Design a binder for this molecule. Structure first.
Ligand SMILES: *[C@H]1[C@H](O)[C@@H](O)[C@H](O)[C@@H](CO)[C@@H]1NCCCCCCCCN=[N+]=N
Length: 779
């Protein structure tokens, strides 16, 4: 039995007293509220919130039976007797407490028909209603087509009613999404903070904008993060690492970054972890290695882990520095891991953080450009391990999150003019604000492992992680390459956030070590990835601005059709491309549930119109099915080997014209690819294109804003290819000057405007300078 007794309003927050204790309510924005039960008691702070101490002005009104506490769009309605809080957007019920709060336990009602995404990485179906699962980050080695518990859980859900609910608790716990009781959402933890956060929105984009506003926005990664990575588990030597960089050159595959797994610090998988320094028998001249790679535009990333083994060179020093978590007796805690016997660096302590940070600083000074943190669940984390702020079970799901924060802060302190690259396997809600780029762990080399990746990506993307990706080609076990699976996985790779093939080294993960057929297929696609950098990097910019994920689910296309929520086989890559990965062997055709409208075959230019019915496309081995939305501007630059050579002096833009799209817009974001302050300081060149398409005219308005950046081209040579262009356009005006449109020999003359009747493509070639440009095509 819980009932209201009294309330006070202090520092814009509502403090309610019930018979059971105090509850603190603070609006973190107009659309988001933090509800803290046991507010009078000492407890761990928020991990989810970017500004945990903010509380914006709200209005409180009181009635006989209720209080209402209201920000601009979200309202909390507090029923006095019995005590229960419910949440409204406008006049619409989002979520109501059932018994609410009662070791730690929250119970809410679910509405009939309500669909619930969430929980982070699980392979259960996109709608997790009907499922129960733990909140305890944990390895799932070799997973394929099913998982209730893996590396990176999130204590959060997204509802078809367009709210996001976060359980802001770091402890070992559980989520029961109407499994045990069909109309009850239950959140449980053994200990930790007794708080939740509700975020509302008017659309899925806005919801995500509102969520990332209070949990954190990902800073723009360095543009090289969008390039080709060489990786395996693991390069065994400097000579082998150099030979791999060389293989990319001699095989003509793009390469930005080479990744070094655990052999960089010892010759065996076991026994060396914690050395955190070069194994000189196998990496004899590592400074030269990294410098030599830098001359070829290639970055070096090194693996690190939380654990320091008692067999490692740094055990005695870690103990001396008090860097390791302790037992209740106060000695360093040691325990068995896969890798051997050892302790865990206490990233929650001053001592642990300074010690680990110093090691990162030193290696970064030597030439390391980015960082890979593996095993941050932490993979093994015995219950009686004590960290500075609590025991293992209490802090477990935030260890990785704090590890990212530590490393992020460290990298910014060392290199304030560079964007940190931090790739980790486990985090918390908000970890994206520390630049965390997650990957979906040790996936099996099976079709099932591939077939799960869109589900996993969308689930993480929706709740803050735009750069979620997979080990391309698969990671775990296998005895010989499954060639078709590998090709499909690396094709899909082009259209997902990070291009990082990676696997256990008994089978090659890198595309340069594949057979002639496989390379003939993948080489033009890895180059396509580079040619498409302006499209991808523009989506990255939008992710930084608004949280908008790079991969978007099919359900964004129609928010009034909740059945689309179940789709985990077709997704949007940026605004304009609907991608359907092939995820089983021998598939001869696919049925693509394209939204109502006009669509083009990305590869073949075929125009399709549909009023709802799916489109059936044949498959081939050299592509996966990709449709372009009518009204898309697809921007390309010439392929380079490394993003260090990126230029946009030459632009090629493809516009997909159709009379059904009378107004279309596109943008291309350009900056120096490296300055972490480029967006804040307007040191960029934002190119905008607008098409106006009427019965007798097609008009393009081109412009640039922003303050520019060093090396920005003043004038770009631009080729605009208009697909599905009318054969009736007779003239072009460029800023009022009339130019005839040639109707022959478009590929064989230096034509300024030419219509190719066989391809229905109208090509315009012009100089795009700093002033506004209008191109008018007239029948
Ligand atoms: C962490 C990370 O997820 C991977 O991408 C890394 O490459 C590795 C190595 O640093 C790490 N996971 C290691 C898993 C090792 C298990 C090896 C088992 C051998 C086969 N046994 N069976 N069955």
């Amino acid at each position: 039995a819980v009932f209201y007794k009294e309330h006070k309003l202090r520092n814009d927050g509502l403090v309610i007293t019930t018979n059971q204790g105090n509850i603190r309510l603070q609006f973190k924005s107009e659309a988001a509220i933090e509800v803290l039960y046991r507010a009078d008691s000492k407890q761990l702070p928020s991990f989810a919130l970017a500004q945990p101490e903010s509380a914006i002005k709200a209005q409180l009104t009181e009635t006989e039976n209720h209080l209402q506490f209201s920000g601009g769009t979200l309202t909390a309605r507090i029923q006095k007797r019995p005590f229960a809080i419910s949440y409204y957007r406008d006049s619409e019920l989002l979520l109501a407490e059932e018994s609410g709060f009662q070791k730690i336990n929250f119970r809410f009602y679910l509405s009939p028909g309500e669909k619930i995404l969430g929980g982070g990485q699980r392979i259960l179906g996109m709608d997790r209603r009907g499922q129960r699962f733990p909140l305890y980050n944990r390895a799932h080695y070799g997973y394929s087509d099913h998982s209730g518990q893996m590396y990176f859980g999130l204590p959060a859900i997204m509802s078809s009613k367009q709210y996001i609910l976060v359980f802001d608790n770091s402890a070992s716990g559980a989520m029961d999404i109407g499994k045990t009781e069909s109309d009850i959402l239950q959140l449980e933890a053994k200990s930790g903070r007794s708080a939740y956060i509700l975020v509302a929105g008017n659309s899925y984009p806005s919801l995500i904008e509102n969520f990332t506003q209070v949990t954190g926005r990902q800073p723009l990664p360095p543009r090289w993060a969008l390039g080709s990575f060489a990786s395996r588990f693991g390069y065994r030597s400097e000579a082998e690492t150099r030979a791999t960089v060389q293989k990319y050159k001699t095989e003509d595959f793009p390469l930005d970054t080479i990744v070094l797994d655990l052999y960089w610090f010892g010759k065996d998988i076991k026994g060396h972890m914690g050395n955190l320094d070069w194994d000189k028998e196998n990496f004899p001249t590592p400074l030269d290695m990294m410098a030599d790679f830098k001359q070829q535009g290639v970055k070096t990333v090194l693996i690190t882990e939380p654990f320091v083994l008692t067999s490692s060179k740094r055990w005695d020093d870690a103990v001396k520095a008090k860097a390791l978590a302790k037992d209740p007796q106060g000695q360093p805690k040691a325990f068995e891991l896969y890798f051997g016997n050892g302790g865990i660096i206490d990233v929650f302590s001053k001592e642990g953080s300074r010690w680990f940070s110093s090691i990162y600083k030193d290696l970064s000074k030597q030439g390391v450009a980015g960082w890979w943190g593996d095993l941050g669940e932490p993979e093994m984390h015995p219950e009686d391990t004590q960290h500075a702020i609590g025991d293992a079970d209490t802090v477990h799901n935030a260890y990785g999150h704090r590890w990212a924060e530590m490393l992020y802060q460290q990298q910014l302190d060392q290199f304030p003019e560079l964007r940190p690259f931090i790739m980790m396997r486990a985090g918390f809600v908000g970890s994206q604000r520390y630049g965390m780029i997650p990957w979906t762990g040790d996936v099996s080399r099976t079709w099932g492992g591939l077939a799960s990746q869109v589900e996993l990506a969308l689930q993480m993307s929706l709740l803050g992680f735009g750069y979620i990706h997979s080990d391309l080609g698969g990671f775990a076990d296998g005895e010989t390459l499954d060639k078709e699976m590998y090709i499909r996985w690396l094709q899909y790779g082009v259209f997902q956030p990070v291009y990082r093939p990676h696997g256990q080294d008994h089978i090659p993960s890198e595309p340069v070590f594949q057979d002639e057929e496989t390379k003939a297929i993948l080489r033009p696609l890895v180059k396509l990835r580079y040619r498409m950098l302006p499209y991808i990097y523009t989506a990255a910019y939008q992710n930084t601005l608004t949280g908008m994920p790079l991969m978007r689910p099919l359900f964004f296309s129609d928010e009034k059709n909740p059945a689309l929520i179940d789709n985990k086989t077709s997704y949007f890559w940026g605004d304009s491309l609907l991608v359907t990965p092939i995820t089983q062997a021998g598939v001869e055709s696919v049925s693509i549930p394209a939204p109502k409208g006009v669509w083009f075959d990305f590869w073949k230019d075929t125009r399709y119109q549909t009023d709802g019915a799916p489109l059936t496309l044949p498959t081939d081995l050299h592509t996966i099915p990709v449709l372009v939305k009518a009204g898309a501007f697809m921007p390309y630059v010439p392929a380079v080997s490394t993003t260090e050579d990126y230029r946009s002096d030459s632009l090629e833009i493809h516009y997909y014209a159709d009379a059904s799209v009378p107004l279309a817009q596109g943008e291309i974001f350009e900056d120096d690819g490296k300055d972490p302050n480029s967006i804040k300081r307007n040191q960029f060149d934002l190119l905008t294109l607008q098409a106006t398409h009427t019965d007798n005219q097609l008009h393009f308005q081109l412009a640039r804003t922003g303050k520019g950046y060093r090396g920005m081209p003043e004038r770009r040579a631009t080729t605009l290819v208009i697909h599905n262009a009318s054969d009736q356009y007779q003239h072009l005006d460029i800023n009022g000057k009339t130019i005839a449109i040639a109707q022959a020999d478009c590929a064989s003359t230096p034509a300024l405007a030419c219509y190719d009747q066989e391809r229905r493509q109208l090509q315009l070639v012009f100089t795009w300078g700093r002033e506004a440009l209008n191109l008018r095509l007239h029948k």
